[PDB]
């Protein structure tokens, strides 16, 4: 699984950047994105996807184990709509 460790190492052998800043950029990368989502801003990354924010209302739910119907509290989640470019590169993938 791709981790921040592998991402930093990549920037070291592709951009020749020290692992230090290579590890600091990967952190600030996801950080800045999370700061935009929490602030209520859409994140549109061309050639990748789009992190949307939809306010879901309180809908009926339950306890998957027993079956006790419990109303799922409303909350703002963070969806991800992959671009057409990304889909065309993952359409022919393979779980490995």
Partner DNA sequence: TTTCTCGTTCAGCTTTAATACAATAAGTTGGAATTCTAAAAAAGCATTGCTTATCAATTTGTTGCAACGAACAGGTCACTATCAGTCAAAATATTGAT
The footprint of DNA (CB under 7 A) covers 1, 3-5, 27, 44, 46-50, 56, 59, 61-65, 68, 70, 72-73, 77, 79, 81, 83-86
- C-beta of 15 vs 61, nearer to DNA: 61
**H or E element in which residue 75 lies:** strand 75-82
CB of 51 to DNA, least distance (A): 11
CB of 79 to DNA, least distance (A): 7
CB of 35 to DNA, least distance (A): 16
Cα–Cα distance, 19 to 32 (Å, whole number): 20
- C-beta of 5 vs 15, nearer to DNA: 5
Count of Cβ atoms closer than 10 Å to residue 50 Cβ = 14
Kindly tell me the sign of the dihedral angle through the C-alpha atoms of 74, 34, 43, 19: negative
Cα–Cα distance, 82 to 49 (Å, whole number): 4
């Amino acid at each position: 699984a791709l981790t921040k460790a592998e991402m930093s190492e990549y920037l070291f052998d592709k951009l020749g950047l020290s692992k230090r800043d290579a590890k600091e950029l990967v952190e600030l990368f996801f950080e800045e994105i999370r700061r935009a989502l929490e602030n209520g801003e859409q994140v549109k990354l061309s050639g990748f996807g789009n992190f949307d924010l939809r306010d879901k209302n309180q809908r009926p739910g339950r306890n998957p184990k027993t079956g006790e119907d419990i109303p799922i509290t409303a909350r703002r989640v963070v969806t991800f709509r992959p671009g057409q470019k990304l889909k065309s590169r993952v359409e022919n993938a393979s779980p490995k």
